[PDB]
């Protein structure tokens, strides 16, 4: 646009409301629009006599030209140095003090609640915390003092701009629509980029932003972003200035942003020497804040959150992999390259293309690959990398350490760098830090990693704001907190479960299924009925029945050795629950019983699943919930063939099921001291991360209303002090999930062709997930019965288990 740059910034510098074009703007960002008046750098930028007051300069007469001031009014004037009262008035520095615990707010006359100030780092690796310690010193002070976490997790891609705004939202990028660095968005039919103009138009940016939560909630707040140029003294002095406003125009939450060590990383290294100088430079800033801070008495009354965004990994130009090396037809595709791959049509006129044909030239091809294709769909549920138009259908995921570009030309005609970031949110390089400061957070405290998702509701509980919907879990970080807990109540079941006893004669179904189960007692007889009645129940449900969240037709069954949640819309189990002890056996499924399927006289032909359906489907076949391997003895094996225990499976899933039912979980147990596991299919035909309607289903057992599930799910819970068996334990809970894909091959695992003990838990790692993932993909809630408080359900319900080594 054109702008009227004679205008003036005078008495407007850092001006909190912005200013439309044509007039010239003074805020924080005038300088990323081109757009700043003609006196900005002389009346805004001062640099004369750098940062820091000298003995000297004590008592000076104001010389307003001074980028900061050492005169006696600069107190009442909000302009000192960071170091007035040290170097001045023989005060120490915050970092030399003892640390002492913040009990209450300790704040001036006029505040109304204490202010809160997020230092972002970009590129913050999570071990620079203990790696760079000794030359970090007001960093540590925070972190020891305060409430830390070991490390905190980035959501994928594991990029700035993606990781930035999901702290400020609580949203994942597919949600907020910053879904990399670089985007295309084929409704507007526009490009976002890191340079440029594009990215500053409103349409990109979705969900709602802390500062946007605050404003229309009557909290004033400072601006969040910093144009690069002003130097990172300017942007500490700005927001000291801006917090000695009157109360009437003073904002109550504030960022600091710093390119660094990200900058530095992609140059260096993570751990290159050149990287202790800005570590060492970050501290500097942490210290010039806290002390500006001490000065206007505001140390023990603001809440400090330092956080990052991502980590960084030691990637150099020979480790990529070159597209140009798999397929014929290279120039006919866009690549989005680097530590991530998105792969699109270069022409949308092009009626050649097919995305079958470019996965499959790209699917195990080279012995050592570093990179694997996906379609966005099936990738990984725990990354929620798929629900966006501006995602591309083709997706690759980087091995660490690797680049993947289309032509070797693009790498040395577009080495050089020696880190970057982008990769799996698993990934240990790539996880960032949390530290929280202050009144409102705990003293001396450790908590367990968490997702960087969960920060705004902690923010806005921080700020005593409602927040905007988002995909944190409020409540599951209230562990962080002395006051301004959050106490959410549990959902309210939607549906109630019906209780169906014998209601059907074994001649009222014609499902085509046969088993050879006819041989003919008071002992069992009264015993049989017992466990049909719930008499093992206790056993098998140990966090009661999951609440089942919307409007549907089930049923409770009990069984001697598990408990279901059986739909009659679905015709299968919402949910199958059972204990595996330490000490139970693994069994076979005997000869007689290889195809037995029974009708169960409780449900109605009409609400079973049939054989014949299975038979006439020559790619579908069938497998069970509870494993019938795991059956506590010959005659309670029968319940495990049900036709109400039954779900549809492709023979290639059958492989990995079947293992992980008749090696895995009893391996489960005898490590974790027995486990409780919890399975069931999911729906997710439109990859939106939550539970599909019948009418969104798009595959059917053929010939039938059977659906077919997209991934099945199991949760697998045990006693967190391992001397206690899962059944019996008396504190808190462990948990480790998985969503798996129901895929009708292997082509993810390309050592497939080998024994399953050699690829199958690798596949099921790989798509590890937390139990809230599994919530919103069935309208579950699970753990409702516990001895526990809801907030720590809560954060079992966020944990993921991640099978990284220790950071
Ligand atoms: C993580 O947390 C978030 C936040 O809670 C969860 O996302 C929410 O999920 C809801 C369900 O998917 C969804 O609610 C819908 O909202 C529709 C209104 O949408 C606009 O308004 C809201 C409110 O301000 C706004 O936030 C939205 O912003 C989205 O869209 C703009 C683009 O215009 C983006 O800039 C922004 O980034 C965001 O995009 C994301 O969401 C959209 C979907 O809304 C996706 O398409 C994107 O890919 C991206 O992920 C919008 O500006 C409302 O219209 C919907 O109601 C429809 O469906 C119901 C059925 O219940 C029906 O009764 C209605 O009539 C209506 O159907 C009609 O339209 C259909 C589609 O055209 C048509 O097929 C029908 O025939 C009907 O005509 C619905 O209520 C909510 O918008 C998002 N919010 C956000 C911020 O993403 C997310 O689920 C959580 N994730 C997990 C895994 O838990
Ligand atoms: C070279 N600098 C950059 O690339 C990033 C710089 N970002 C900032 O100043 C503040 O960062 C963000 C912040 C700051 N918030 C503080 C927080 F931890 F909550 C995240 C929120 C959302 C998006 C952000 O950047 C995309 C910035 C500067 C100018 C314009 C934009 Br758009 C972004
Ligand atoms: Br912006
Ligand atoms: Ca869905
Ligand atoms: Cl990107
Ligand atoms: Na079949
Ligand atoms: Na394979
Ligand atoms: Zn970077």
Request: charged share 25%; hydrophobic share 30%.
């Amino acid at each position: 646009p054109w702008t009227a740059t004679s205008g003036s910034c005078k008495g407007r510098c850092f001006e909190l409301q912005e200013v439309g074009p044509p007039d010239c703007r003074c805020d924080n960002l005038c300088k990323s629009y081109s757009s700043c008046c003609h006196d900005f750098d002389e009346l805004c930028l001062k640099t004369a006599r750098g940062w820091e007051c000298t003995k000297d300069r004590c008592g000076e007469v104001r010389n307003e030209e001074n980028a900061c001031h050492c005169s006696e009014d600069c107190l009442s004037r909000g302009d000192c140095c960071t170091n007035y009262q040290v170097v001045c008035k023989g005060e120490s520095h915050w970092v030399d003090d003892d640390c002492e615990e913040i009990k209450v707010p300790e704040c001036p006359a006029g505040f109304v609640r204490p202010p809160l100030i997020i230092f972002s780092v970009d590129g913050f690796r999570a071990s620079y915390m203990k790696k760079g310690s000794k030359v970090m010193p007001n960093i540590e002070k925070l972190r020891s003092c305060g409430t830390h976490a070991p490390y905190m997790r980035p959501v994928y891609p594991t990029k700035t701009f993606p990781n930035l705004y999901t702290l400020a939202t609580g949203l994942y990028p597919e949600s907020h629509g910053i879904v990399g660095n670089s985007m295309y968005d084929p409704v507007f039919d526009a490009s976002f980029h890191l340079r440029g103009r594009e990215k500053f138009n409103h349409r990109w940016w979705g969900g709602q932003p802390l500062w946007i939560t605050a404003t229309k909630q009557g909290v004033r707040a400072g601006t969040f972003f910093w144009s690069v140029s002003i130097p990172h003294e300017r942007r500490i002095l700005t927001i000291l200035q801006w917090l000695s406003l009157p109360d009437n125009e003073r904002p109550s939450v504030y960022a600091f942003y710093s390119e660094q060590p990200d900058f530095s990383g992609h140059k260096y290294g993570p751990f290159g020497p050149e990287m202790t100088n800005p570590l060492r430079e970050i501290d500097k800033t942490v210290g010039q804040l806290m002390d500006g801070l001490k000065q206007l008495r505001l140390h023990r009354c603001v809440n400090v959150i330092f956080v990052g965004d991502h980590g960084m990994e030691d990637v150099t130009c020979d480790r990529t992999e070159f597209l140009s090396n798999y397929l014929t037809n290279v120039d006919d595709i866009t690549l989005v390259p680097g530590t991530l791959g998105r792969i699109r049509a270069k022409s949308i006129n092009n009626s050649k293309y097919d995305p079958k044909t470019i996965i499959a030239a790209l699917t195990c091809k080279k012995p050592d690959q570093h990179f694997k294709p996906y379609m966005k769909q099936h990738l990984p549920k725990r990354l929620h990398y798929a629900n966006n138009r501006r995602i591309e259908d083709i997706h690759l995921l980087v091995d660490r350490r690797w680049h993947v570009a289309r032509k070797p030309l693009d790498v040395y005609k577009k080495c050089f760098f020696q880190g970057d970031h982008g990769f799996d949110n698993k990934v240990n390089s790539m996880q960032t830090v949390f530290v929280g400061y202050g009144p409102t957070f705990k003293y001396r405290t450790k908590v367990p990693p968490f997702e960087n998702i969960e920060l705004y509701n902690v923010m806005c509980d921080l700020l005593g704001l409602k927040p905007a919907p988002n995909n944190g879990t409020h409540g599951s970080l209230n562990h962080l907190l002395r006051t301004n807990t959050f106490r959410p109540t549990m959902p309210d079941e939607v549906s109630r479960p019906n209780y169906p006893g014998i209601m059907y004669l074994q001649s009222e179904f014609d499902l085509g299924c046969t088993c050879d189960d006819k041989v003919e007692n008071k002992l069992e007889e009264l015993n049989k009925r017992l466990h049909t009645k719930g008499s093992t129940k206790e056993r098998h449900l140990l966090y009661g029945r999951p609440a089942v969240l919307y409007r549907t037709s089930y049923d409770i069954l009990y069984h001697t050795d598990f408990e279901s949640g059986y739909s009659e819309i679905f015709l299968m189990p919402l949910w199958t629950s059972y204990t595996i002890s330490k000490q139970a056996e693994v069994s076979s499924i005997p000869e007689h019983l290889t195809n037995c399927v029974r009708p169960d006289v409780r449900v109605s032909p009409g609400f079973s699943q049939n054989c014949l359906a299975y038979k006439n489907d020559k790619q579908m076949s069938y497998g069970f919930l509870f494993p019938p391997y795991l059956s506590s003895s010959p005659e309670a094996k029968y319940d495990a063939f049900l036709v109400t225990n039954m779900v549809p499976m492709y023979p290639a899933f059958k492989r990995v099921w079947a293992y992980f039912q008749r090696v895995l979980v009893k391996k489960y147990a005898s490590e974790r001291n027995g486990v409780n596991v919890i399975s069931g299919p999911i729906f997710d035909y439109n990859y939106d991360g939550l539970r599909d309607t019948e009418d969104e289903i798009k595959q059917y057992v053929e010939g039938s209303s059977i659906p077919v599930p997209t991934h099945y799910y199991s949760i697998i819970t045990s006693c967190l002090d391992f001397t206690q068996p899962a059944d019996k334990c008396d504190g808190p809970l462990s948990v480790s999930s998985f969503i798996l894909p129901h895929r009708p091959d292997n082509d993810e695992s390309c050592n497939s062709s080998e024994d399953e003990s050699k690829w199958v838990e690798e596949l099921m790692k790989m798509h590890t997930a937390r139990v809230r993932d599994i919530e919103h993909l069935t309208g579950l809630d699970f753990y409702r019965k516990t001895s526990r408080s809801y907030s720590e359900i809560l954060t079992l319900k966020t944990y993921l288990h991640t099978y990284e080594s220790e950071i």
